[PDB]
Amino acid sequence: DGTEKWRFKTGKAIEASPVIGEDGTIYVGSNDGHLYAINPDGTEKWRFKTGKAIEASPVIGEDGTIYVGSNDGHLYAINPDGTEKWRFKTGKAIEASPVIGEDGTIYVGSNDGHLYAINP
Amino acid sequence: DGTEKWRFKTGKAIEASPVIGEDGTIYVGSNDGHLYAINPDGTEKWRFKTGKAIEASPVIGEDGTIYVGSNDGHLYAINPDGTEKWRFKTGKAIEASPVIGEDGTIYVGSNDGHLYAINP
Amino acid sequence: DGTEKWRFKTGKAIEASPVIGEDGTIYVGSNDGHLYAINPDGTEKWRFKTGKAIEASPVIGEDGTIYVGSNDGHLYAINPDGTEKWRFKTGKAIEASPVIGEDGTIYVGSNDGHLYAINP
Helix, strand or coil, rough: CCEEEEEEEECCCCCCCEEECCCCCEEEECCCCCCEEEECCCCCEEEECCCCCCCCCCCCCCCCCCHHHHHHHHEEEEECCCCCCEEECCCCCCCHHHHHHCCCCCCEEEECCEEEEEEE | CCEEEEECCCCCCCCCCCCEECCCCCCEEECCCEEEEEEECCCCEEEEEEEEECCCCCCECCCEEEEEEECCCEEEEEECCEEEEEEEEEEHHHHHHHHEECCCCEEEEECCCCEECCCC | CCEEEEEEEEECCCCCCCCCCCCEEEEEEEECCCCEEEEECCCEEEEEEECCCCCCCCCCCCCCEEECCCCCEEEEEECCCCCCEEEECCCCCCCCCCCCCCCEEEEECCCCCCEECCCC
């Protein structure tokens, strides 16, 4: 078929693939610095502002927390309702997706040269 | 061991990982703008031309359709036999792989800032 | 919680996601040219030197071998103990992760424009 079901506008280029949660919500970062949560019907569930572009896909944790790195150097942990659970500061931009260990530890590399292991 | 089984030429740099189909076919996009379907013995099954470089890996749907974004701005849906199923225009280059939802909807972000949801 | 469990210093930016192996070891490539194997407690298990930045995530085979491409043009197969199993030369930088077929063949694209199939 190949027809448009909908389009959803962000402010700048979307450089990484979206991620779909179990409840169908689609998550996508934008170069406009926001993480968007989009309902299956194309309406905005919420958006979360980081300070600079989001270059890599978000990752969804076992408990539903959404993790995303920003060019503002922080790794963000976002609750399913769109409020910030926490943010973790690294020295430079985070250009790749975090990885979650089986025991819940969040691993993320930074342009500051370190691999960080973070408690969930 | 580590010896070469074969090598397959494309015109320019290959910037994303190949993807392997159920039948063993290896799919890979090239900066020469073509999507290549390569047999396990390294001969070309087919190639599909897009207008500009392909920067992200293709994605294979459950029915075997091969989806690939192009810097020419279109998302291409290609049948296993190399014929075009459809192509979907966005405003600018598609730099990341599409993602397929459970109901089959295809999601793809574009450098034009939109997330597109496309009916398969 | 959101506090640092530990951090691990490499010489330059880490551009790709880390990869957790089947024994829990964390593997990550650095722009300083090394692949690092990091224990869960944050101590270095070993590091493996390539000639130039590693831009993509390593891939781990079912037998424990770790594969990683380098901007020095080589694909490296590394044993779990950090010794080189073999090294495979391509003409130019390898910018994306390899992929392993069901028969064990290693597939990898290169900036020299070829898709290589390598015997394991």
